[PDB]
Enzyme design. Structure first.
Site, PDB file in Angstrom:
ATOM      1  N   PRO D 114       0.850  -1.272   0.025  1.00 43.45           N
ATOM      2  CA  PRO D 114       0.045  -0.030  -0.073  1.00 43.45           C
ATOM      3  C   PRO D 114       0.749   1.377  -0.045  1.00 43.45           C
ATOM      4  O   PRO D 114       1.765   1.333   0.676  1.00 43.45           O
ATOM      5  CB  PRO D 114      -0.926  -0.103   1.212  1.00 43.45           C
ATOM      6  N   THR D 119      -3.287   2.498  -7.360  1.00 45.29           N
ATOM      7  CA  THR D 119      -4.633   3.166  -7.025  1.00 45.29           C
ATOM      8  C   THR D 119      -4.988   4.578  -8.241  1.00 45.29           C
ATOM      9  O   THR D 119      -6.168   4.986  -8.418  1.00 45.29           O
ATOM     10  CB  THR D 119      -5.393   3.566  -5.856  1.00 45.29           C
ATOM     11  N   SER D 435      11.880 -19.715   5.217  1.00 46.44           N
ATOM     12  CA  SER D 435      12.721 -19.202   4.297  1.00 46.44           C
ATOM     13  C   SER D 435      13.602 -18.579   5.358  1.00 46.44           C
ATOM     14  O   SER D 435      14.625 -17.764   4.680  1.00 46.44           O
ATOM     15  CB  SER D 435      12.000 -18.138   3.357  1.00 46.44           C
ATOM     16  N   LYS D 478      11.747  -8.432   0.015  1.00 43.40           N
ATOM     17  CA  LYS D 478      12.691  -8.670   1.135  1.00 43.40           C
ATOM     18  C   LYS D 478      14.060  -7.874   0.978  1.00 43.40           C
ATOM     19  O   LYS D 478      14.639  -7.240   1.727  1.00 43.40           O
ATOM     20  CB  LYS D 478      12.847 -10.175   1.363  1.00 43.40           C
TER      21      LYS D 478
HETATM   22  B1  LIG Z   1       9.867 -16.875   4.370  1.00 42.45           B
HETATM   23  O1  LIG Z   1       9.117 -17.901   4.314  1.00 42.45           O
HETATM   24  O2  LIG Z   1       9.746 -16.058   2.855  1.00 42.45           O
HETATM   25  C1  LIG Z   1       9.733 -15.954   5.588  1.00 42.45           C
HETATM   26  C2  LIG Z   1      10.599 -16.780   6.740  1.00 42.45           C
HETATM   27  C3  LIG Z   1      10.544 -15.702   7.826  1.00 42.45           C
HETATM   28  C4  LIG Z   1      11.731 -15.103   8.386  1.00 42.45           C
HETATM   29  C5  LIG Z   1      11.935 -14.377   9.665  1.00 42.45           C
HETATM   30  C6  LIG Z   1      10.619 -14.089  10.182  1.00 42.45           C
HETATM   31  C7  LIG Z   1       9.262 -14.691   9.836  1.00 42.45           C
HETATM   32  C8  LIG Z   1       9.350 -15.503   8.532  1.00 42.45           C
HETATM   33  N1  LIG Z   1       8.535 -15.919   5.862  1.00 42.45           N
HETATM   34  C9  LIG Z   1       7.785 -14.935   5.780  1.00 42.45           C
HETATM   35  O3  LIG Z   1       8.198 -13.938   4.988  1.00 42.45           O
HETATM   36  C10 LIG Z   1       6.730 -14.700   6.557  1.00 42.45           C
HETATM   37  C11 LIG Z   1       5.226 -14.883   5.485  1.00 42.45           C
HETATM   38  C12 LIG Z   1       5.416 -16.153   4.845  1.00 42.45           C
HETATM   39  C13 LIG Z   1       5.281 -17.222   5.530  1.00 42.45           C
HETATM   40  C14 LIG Z   1       5.376 -18.425   5.057  1.00 42.45           C
HETATM   41  C15 LIG Z   1       5.413 -18.817   3.904  1.00 42.45           C
HETATM   42  C16 LIG Z   1       5.763 -17.433   2.941  1.00 42.45           C
HETATM   43  C17 LIG Z   1       5.642 -16.245   3.662  1.00 42.45           C
HETATM   44  N2  LIG Z   1       6.572 -13.198   7.076  1.00 42.45           N
HETATM   45  C18 LIG Z   1       6.224 -13.179   8.202  1.00 42.45           C
HETATM   46  O4  LIG Z   1       6.098 -13.867   9.063  1.00 42.45           O
HETATM   47  C19 LIG Z   1       6.407 -11.484   8.572  1.00 42.45           C
HETATM   48  C20 LIG Z   1       6.013 -11.094  10.131  1.00 42.45           C
HETATM   49  N3  LIG Z   1       6.399 -10.019  10.344  1.00 42.45           N
HETATM   50  C21 LIG Z   1       6.377  -8.907   9.703  1.00 42.45           C
HETATM   51  C22 LIG Z   1       6.528  -9.347   8.183  1.00 42.45           C
HETATM   52  N4  LIG Z   1       6.466 -10.600   7.699  1.00 42.45           N
HETATM   53  N1  LIG Z   2       5.894   7.382  -8.060  1.00 41.71           N
HETATM   54  C1  LIG Z   2       5.140   8.153  -7.693  1.00 41.71           C
HETATM   55  N2  LIG Z   2       5.024   9.364  -8.109  1.00 41.71           N
HETATM   56  C2  LIG Z   2       4.247  10.639  -7.504  1.00 41.71           C
HETATM   57  N3  LIG Z   2       3.361  10.367  -6.680  1.00 41.71           N
HETATM   58  C3  LIG Z   2       3.070   9.074  -5.952  1.00 41.71           C
HETATM   59  C4  LIG Z   2       4.000   8.157  -6.682  1.00 41.71           C
HETATM   60  N4  LIG Z   2       3.602   6.729  -5.835  1.00 41.71           N
HETATM   61  C5  LIG Z   2       2.496   7.193  -4.866  1.00 41.71           C
HETATM   62  N5  LIG Z   2       2.247   8.564  -5.152  1.00 41.71           N
HETATM   63  C6  LIG Z   2       1.254   9.533  -4.480  1.00 41.71           C
HETATM   64  O1  LIG Z   2       1.177   9.052  -3.260  1.00 41.71           O
HETATM   65  C7  LIG Z   2      -0.249   8.799  -2.939  1.00 41.71           C
HETATM   66  C8  LIG Z   2      -0.560   7.427  -2.615  1.00 41.71           C
HETATM   67  O2  LIG Z   2      -0.830   6.422  -3.627  1.00 41.71           O
HETATM   68  P1  LIG Z   2      -1.775   5.546  -3.724  1.00 41.71           P
HETATM   69  O3  LIG Z   2      -2.600   5.610  -4.969  1.00 41.71           O
HETATM   70  O4  LIG Z   2      -2.778   5.847  -2.573  1.00 41.71           O
HETATM   71  O5  LIG Z   2      -1.233   3.946  -3.699  1.00 41.71           O
HETATM   72  P2  LIG Z   2      -2.041   2.706  -3.739  1.00 41.71           P
HETATM   73  O6  LIG Z   2      -2.262   2.632  -5.160  1.00 41.71           O
HETATM   74  O7  LIG Z   2      -1.149   1.769  -3.114  1.00 41.71           O
HETATM   75  O8  LIG Z   2      -3.317   3.221  -3.042  1.00 41.71           O
HETATM   76  C9  LIG Z   2      -0.945   9.249  -4.109  1.00 41.71           C
HETATM   77  O9  LIG Z   2      -2.060  10.262  -3.948  1.00 41.71           O
HETATM   78  C10 LIG Z   2      -0.093   9.626  -5.342  1.00 41.71           C
HETATM   79  O10 LIG Z   2      -0.356  10.938  -5.667  1.00 41.71           O
END
Ligand SMILES: *[B]([O])([O])[C]([C]C1=[C][C]=[C][C]=[C]1)[N]C(=O)[C]([C]C1=[C][C]=[C][C]=[C]1)[N]C(=O)C1=[C]N=[C][C]=N1
Ligand SMILES: Nc1ncnc2c1ncn2[C@@H]1O[C@H](COP(=O)(O)OP(=O)(O)O)[C@@H](O)[C@H]1O
Ligand SMILES: *[B]([O])([O])[C]([C]C1=[C][C]=[C][C]=[C]1)[N]C(=O)[C]([C]C1=[C][C]=[C][C]=[C]1)[N]C(=O)C1=[C]N=[C][C]=N1
Ligand SMILES: *[B]([O])([O])[C]([C]C1=[C][C]=[C][C]=[C]1)[N]C(=O)[C]([C]C1=[C][C]=[C][C]=[C]1)[N]C(=O)C1=[C]N=[C][C]=N1
Ligand SMILES: Nc1ncnc2c1ncn2[C@@H]1O[C@H](COP(=O)(O)OP(=O)(O)O)[C@@H](O)[C@H]1O
Lengths: 537, 139, 264, 538, 70
Positions: D114, D119, D435, D478
């Site tokens: 996000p 969007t 992973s 990552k």
């Molecule tokens: B790996 O599967 O890509 C990875 C291992 C890992 C390392 C360290 C901490 C948590 C997990 N797992 C992840 O990236 C997971 C998501 C996931 C799980 C199973 C299969 C594929 C992907 N990510 C998380 O758990 C996580 C936690 N907090 C913040 C961000 N990501």
């Molecule tokens: N590469 C970029 N260049 C210029 N403006 C960006 C860029 N990425 C995001 N924005 C701006 O930041 C805001 C967040 O983007 P948004 O469209 O909400 O992201 P998402 O598609 O994930 O919802 C928007 O209002 C957009 O104008």
């Protein structure tokens, strides 16, 4: 228009004058409604339904027991007890003659594994009385709606099955068979069984009231038969008002008889293959033993079907004039490499192996139970997707053996120096229950003893610490399977002696039944008295 | 044998399926005299969406050398969807087999039907019942 | 229309590296993609004649391998056993790994195995615990090793009992050091007695294995009946071994003399 | 009344005669009815729905062209390739509008955490073709009923998401963005996603329709764009039908350019503070790093926005004459004390610890794994809120080390004498996955070996039990999070090699990637040669 | 203050279609009548609470009222 013709039709088709009144108002009150209005569609459909259901129509119908006796013989093999029992029932219904004027309709259930002919007899009776046959099946029906329906108001509104059936039958007095009687999921939103009682209470049924129609309908004449695989799944209200006939399976001989007389010729004939192909009796026995596993024949028809059909294909290609006729060696050609070819067990007794039987509504199976005594710390492991009640029977069995170290040929210190594993293939399918109490005990002694155990014998019973075998269920179902399997040397709790009377008598002297009252005697019968493997230490 | 040829011609692989059709057909001809015997099975060609269930329909038709026409039941809502709603006074016609029944001129043709599993049931106006009438030789 | 075409192996490569479904429908699309990436190639630039695709040229056509070959490592290993599995989509070739380490008989089974499969590891361990001398295992490894059975990947969940024999093969070569051949792939259930039960999804596994590029197989007798489903062409190059008993498998698989020092 | 009159106009709009006639019928019934009575009123409502839904009131479709390329260029900074892909997608669209077949195009999805401006990309494509724009956010929908809607006179029924949008849109050919396609629950009651196929396969697209409507809507006319944060929870029937464009995130130096060129003076104009307030280029940065741990710019937009608000309140309380500019020094006035050490986790040889990466659809995260070797009986404890598969990964990693004591010179006697505790803070966040195998191989091995482990390297792999190191998911996500955190080395499995060709050069340029096919390599690479702590025992 | 507590159907917000006296206009208009004027602050209490079960969804109505375009 055709609605004016409909006015003429409604009158022609006899029905109580209240129905005329209601119907005619509906007709009139409709005209105004401008056509195509969804209301219009719905009103019209109701009218249509009302007209099509059999109100007064009759059907020439008869009841000579003896004529009927003959027919049943004409369309079924054996089942003498089962056949006779039906007439014994039927007979009393003769006295009622309507006119008891009370106590009519203690209705039938036909109980047994599937494929045992239950519906076929139904079909047989209703021709025997030269009246119409219909099949309504109640398998896993979750709702009342299905029977007594949803009011005409609501969307996708339709009359229940009962009404549905009656339109389609075309008359007011057919035999109707409700099978999957016990496969009704129950009262998860509401009880649907109830509506059945409404159906099958003679007082009650005369004015059976479906809901899509707003007319009480009369089911007083109709004959009802029911089918099921066990009675443990019927509510008691239905159950208390049924007379029970049990059709519990056939045996290889009984099946082989059935096959040539009915199953084989139908399929040839069905196939259009009449007079160009035939199977030896020897062949058929190949089909029963090696291509099918079940109590009732709904596998043999299916395989004998495969052959007949293949034949047609073959001939048109094709390679005969007159009969090609088949025998054993000629089967895998039509039907494929045998499924169940062994070679079993071998029955040359084995160490930590004992033969137990088991059952369920679809039939009884013959399943082996395996134990390994290995050196270790006295840890017990119980796999084979055993349920918990079965796992307690391992304990009871194991614990009985533990106390009586000397009496039997047991090492005196396994309890803290060996680990047993008790396994019951196959791995996937769940298994539970305590009727195989002894049989785990026999397996365990063998393992520890190192004394082989007989594998000709197949055994059943429950066990307590005291060491008393106890009565158990499903005696006829299990023992058939033993017979079919090629076992002819059973074992049984005493208190289960009685249950032998229900067995068809012929098999009885085809089976050697040792009645045990205590455990010790099981082991004695099963365990050779000189061990083969060196003891475990 | 002739129809045996086509399937090899039009579809590749599928020995087992190719066979199992074949037996349905073979048994078809024999039974053809069919009195009092033919209440014969009707065919389903069960398969996961995306492996040409329909072609095998056409492979046959060519084989059987009668016309081919297809119609799609799944997502169907009306009994009059399978027969005219009414002569006059709905916005109306006769469908859906009937008109399509005269799409190909001949009385003897082949229709194939698909996604009968998927067709609308409770939503309104059951045709699922309608069909039984639709296929049964009895009426 | 006449602008472009694909080498048939290149199709072979789209299926394998860019499809993992029962259906065509994945395929049509992929095939779809190629054609209309020709156009931007042809809108980007014009060529006269027929441009002809070979496998290697596929990756530029929106390609990357986003599924990858199950092609195997044939050379034998210690504490491994080939295996065959099946999904509604198709048949997979999975590998099983086992560890022999100094320990106290603790047993760990990881890789998201299911209870039924786990039980298959217990049956097979217990059967080997009885026949130590017979397979050249330590007389009492049970008392002085902890043992771990793994099936990667970890994420994907597994179950079923058709693995017993593979696990047993793996397990045996763990404690014995005799390498386990990996030409061969095995599907089989095991009783505690060492009997080999029949199994399911036979068409899909061997196909999965054939495409892997291994032509040596093990299978129960009871499952022989179902070799009439594979097309012959597949069958021509299949060295199936039918087994009524598990000992028949270990003798066939485990290489004759161990390669690694015992535990110590 | 003109409620009669309204009837008259209702001819105006342009149903096919079929729809028109059907409409007339229901309108009559309406009259019949008690009028006003409950069903009559709902009949009026349907009538109104039915009539006012957009029928062939299209608007002129401006063509694709270079121009659409340039509308992009001003509305976003960077996205060199993405734009090309968007553009390339549209080129083909033309030929299909050359009408070889009416249509056979694939719909597209834009995937990124996000804030990456999915969007709004579509927003600025609609602009390219002059088409109206409408957003529908699909998550989270239990029921296939919302898209299809209910029965007509149920009585209780509303049409659903497509109809409303369409009707609202008021034109026949608007662009429509199906936001968060990937969040549809597909539970019971039924599976919505299926419903989409009608919506999104042309085949039905041109015919079938809402259950509340009783008539086909040609949705072939509409243009569709899709939005998702991850591809794994989109149904393969749905996924198969799309073409994917992947937007992962931004490095800090990109983020500065988006910020000065786009987000700073956007908020400044909105605040009405134009030309009265400004921010130093190095002032933005402090905003980027100290005030936002996120992979996209929504968090930046929100805080840059905070400066204008406070910028405006302040002025009205006061004055510049005048022009006010803000550098790093003058920020926490506007925002507060920072709450992020921007860089770093302390990147020095630490005993018992390794640097791992993880991700979510939300974004990627650096994450530090800690192991303690404390004398023991041989017990494994796995704190850190580790789902099951992660624990199992810790076991399989531990086992490989157990085999190879001689090789890595661990103590042979440990598993009786040593309790290992593996922890992955924060502790309140569910973590899970395979992973991180190698990372725990490293972390544990360092714990017993007593040799520090380098922390200028972050790594992700799965360690099969043999020791093999197995390919891995979410590579770009990552790796980006590891740039942002200031780690510039990465260990990565070989079999993950292909996924690097889909890394933005920007990120690619700043990293060193080690490719390993085996786990000795890792331990060899990460681990220092001589230990810094007396062994765990004897 | 307009109170949107358990506001069930677009009967308020958007007026009753005027086919009887019993029917009346959506709350907003009741609001704009009470205050003399066209520019009074208005606070829609409890915006979260309202739900859409039976007669269209109010939220749609609310969007129209609050959309600067329409
Ligand atoms: B790996 O599967 O890509 C990875 C291992 C890992 C390392 C360290 C901490 C948590 C997990 N797992 C992840 O990236 C997971 C998501 C996931 C799980 C199973 C299969 C594929 C992907 N990510 C998380 O758990 C996580 C936690 N907090 C913040 C961000 N990501
Ligand atoms: N590469 C970029 N260049 C210029 N403006 C960006 C860029 N990425 C995001 N924005 C701006 O930041 C805001 C967040 O983007 P948004 O469209 O909400 O992201 P998402 O598609 O994930 O919802 C928007 O209002 C957009 O104008
Ligand atoms: B016994 O309770 O009559 C017997 C238990 C048993 C023991 C050993 C092997 C199989 C079964 N019961 C059954 O056979 C049970 C049904 C049952 C269970 C609990 C209480 C009463 C009755 N059937 C099965 O477990 C079964 C049947 N068919 C295939 C697989 N399992
Ligand atoms: B066997 O029972 O037929 C087999 C078990 C197995 C084989 C190889 C590796 C692990 C387990 N079963 C399967 O193929 C199962 C599916 C299954 C389970 C029970 C009954 C029938 C079928 N396969 C898997 O678990 C699996 C996991 N991941 C991918 C593919 N298959
Ligand atoms: N005792 C029997 N004698 C002759 N045929 C039988 C017998 N039992 C079953 N069949 C045949 O096998 C088929 C299956 O029987 P069916 O009526 O379906 O039994 P059920 O209804 O109990 O499953 C029938 O077509 C019937 O002709």
């Amino acid at each position: 228009s055709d609605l004016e013709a409909l006015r003429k039709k409604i009158e022609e088709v006899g029905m109580p004058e209240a129905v005329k009144t209601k119907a005619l108002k509906e007709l009139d009150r409709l005209e105004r409604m401008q056509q195509g209005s969804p209301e219009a569609t719905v009103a019209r459909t109701y009218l249509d339904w009302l007209t099509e259901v059999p109100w007064s129509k009759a059907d020439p119908e008869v009841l000579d027991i003896n004529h009927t006796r003959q027919v049943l013989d004409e369309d079924h093999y054996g089942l003498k007890d089962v056949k006779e029992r039906i007439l014994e029932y039927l007979a009393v219904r003769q006295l009622t003659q309507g006119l008891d004027v009370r106590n009519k309709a203690p209705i039938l259930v036909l109980v047994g594994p599937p494929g045992v002919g239950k519906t076929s007899l139904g079909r047989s009776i209703a021709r025997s009385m030269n009246r119409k046959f219909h099949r309504i099946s109640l398998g896993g029906v979750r709702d009342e709606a299905e029977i007594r329906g949803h009011r005409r108001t609501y969307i996708g509104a339709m009359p229940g099955k009962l009404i549905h059936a009656m339109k389609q039958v075309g008359v007011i007095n057919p035999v109707i068979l409700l099978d999957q009687i016990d496969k009704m999921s129950s009262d998860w939103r509401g009880d649907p069984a109830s509506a059945m009682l409404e159906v099958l209470d003679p007082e009650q049924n005369n004015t059976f009231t479906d809901h899509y129609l707003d007319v009480p309908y009369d089911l007083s004449k109709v004959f009802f038969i029911t089918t099921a695989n066990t009675l443990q799944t019927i509510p008691r209200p239905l159950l208390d008002r049924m007379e029970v006939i049990e059709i519990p399976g056939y045996t290889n001989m009984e099946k082989q008889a059935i096959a040539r007389q009915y199953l084989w010729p139908k399929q040839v004939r069905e196939s259009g293959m009449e007079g160009r192909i035939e199977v030896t009796d020897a062949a058929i026995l190949r089909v029963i033993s090696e291509y099918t596993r079940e109590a009732g024949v709904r596998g043999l028809e299916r395989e004998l079907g495969k052959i007949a059909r293949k034949g047609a294909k073959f001939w048109l290609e094709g390679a005969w004039e007159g009969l090609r006729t088949i025998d054993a060696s000629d089967i895998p050609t039509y039907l494929g490499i045998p499924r169940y070819r062994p070679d079993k067990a071998e029955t040359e007794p084995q160490v930590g192996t004992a033969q137990g039987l088991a059952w369920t509504p679809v039939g009884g199976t013959l399943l082996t139970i395996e134990v390994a005594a290995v050196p270790g710390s006295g840890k017990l492991s119980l796999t084979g997707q055993l349920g918990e009640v079965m796992k307690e029977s391992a304990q009871a069995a194991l614990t009985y053996l533990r106390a009586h170290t000397q009496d039997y040929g047991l090492p005196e210190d396994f309890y803290n120096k060996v680990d047993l594993h008790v396994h019951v293939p196959d791995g996937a399918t769940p298994k539970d229950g305590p009727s195989a109490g002894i049989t785990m005990a026999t397996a365990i002694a063998s393992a520890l003893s190192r004394r082989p155990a007989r594998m000709d014998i197949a055994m059943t019973g429950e066990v307590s610490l005291r060491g008393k075998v106890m009565p158990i269920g499903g005696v006829k179902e299990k023992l058939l399977a033993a017979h079919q399997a090629g076992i002819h040397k059973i074992v049984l709790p005493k208190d289960n002696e009685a249950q032998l009377e229900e067995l068809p008598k012929e098999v009885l002297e085809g089976l050697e039944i040792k009645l045990v009252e205590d455990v010790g005697e099981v082991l004695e019968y099963l365990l050779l008295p000189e061990p083969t493997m060196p003891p475990v230490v």
